[PDB]
Amino acid sequence: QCVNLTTRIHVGTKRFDNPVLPFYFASTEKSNIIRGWIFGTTLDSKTQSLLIVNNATNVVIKVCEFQFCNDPFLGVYYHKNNKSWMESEFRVYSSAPFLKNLREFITRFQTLLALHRSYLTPGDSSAAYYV
């Protein structure tokens, strides 16, 4: 399923604005927040779109008639016993490895960020790049 995040990753009032941009990309971080990108036109099931996603062991690239979420993301959590951040589930689409350190790299595209589950609490309280 999809989660509605856009408000009318920043927090301790929650704010979210991860807009779809017209179609270089760069990001400086130590937290490995940027995980991938969506490239396409309508960004829905009507046309084919390109999905690029990186994870801990590999990178997957697919072209499909994806039905994307308005606020697509990859969920992560801090594993209580192992004391490290781990992936949970993808919330990028409903239907269908190269990521302080600066990382420098179809009519529209959107950036996929790793979102801490602590942000997915139901309350109003509880990640930067260039294009």
Partner: antibody
């Protein structure tokens, strides 16, 4: 912080019933709300959550597609619309406030009994 | 994401009661414990496995290991004769889960 449930009653299977939880003593619009139900002699079962701004809502599988959760932040009131009720839905329904910044429930109401028969 | 806990615990007054709860999810996320007395709404006793609310006395403590979490109640009194529940949430925040509930008999 006070949460007051109302709208409970006795209905036949297939009928609908609407519950309401009036909130006071806090900034209602900043907190997410939950419904939890407890059948007599049974433990606690989580039913549904709605986010502070109503942007997201989730349901337990057992009530998915039948229950609808909504809120009016201008009336400080939480609503639960239960359609197509079944005998298995007999329970005391509590409204509870989500703790800000965490995954537990801090404040609870008194609960209202709903019987389906 | 299921939570399993024993249906009951029997403890004599003055002894220490240890109420356990297990499940794979509990190795990933924090557990929360509630105490419910008949006719009353559930009251939070422990959060984040081992922390107390300001309304909860030092007799209540918690611990965890692997997939199991434990609520420890020392100096058990008659007033502690209640149904205790373990609670958690999934990794995406779309679902909340309670265990069956443990009836603690003093």
């Amino acid at each position: 912080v006070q949460l007051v449930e109302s709208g409970g009653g006795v209905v036949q299977p297939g009928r609908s019933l609407r519950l309401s939880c009036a909130a006071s003593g806090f900034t209602f619009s900043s907190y997410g709300m939950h419904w939890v139900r407890q059948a007599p002699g049974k433990g606690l079962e989580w039913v549904t959550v709605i986010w502070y701004d109503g942007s997201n809502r989730y349901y337990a599988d057992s009530v998915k597609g039948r229950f609808t959760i909504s809120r009016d932040n201008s009336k400080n009131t939480l609503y639960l619309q239960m359609d197509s009720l079944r005998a298995e839905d007999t329970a005391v329904y509590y409204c509870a406030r989500a703790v800000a910044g965490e995954w537990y429930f801090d404040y609870w109401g008194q609960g209202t009994l709903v019987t389906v028969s | 994401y299921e939570l399993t806990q024993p249906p009951s615990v029997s403890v004599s007054p003055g002894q220490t009661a240890r109420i356990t709860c297990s499940g794979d999810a509990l190795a990933k996320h924090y557990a929360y414990w509630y105490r419910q007395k008949p006719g009353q709404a559930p009251v939070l006793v422990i959060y984040k496995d081992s922390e107390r609310p300001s309304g909860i006395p030092e007799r209540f403590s918690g611990s965890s290991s692997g997939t199991t979490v434990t609520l420890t109640i020392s100096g058990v009194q008659a007033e502690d004769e209640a149904d205790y529940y373990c609670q958690s949430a999934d990794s995406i925040g779309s679902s909340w889960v309670f265990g069956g509930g443990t009836k603690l008999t003093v």
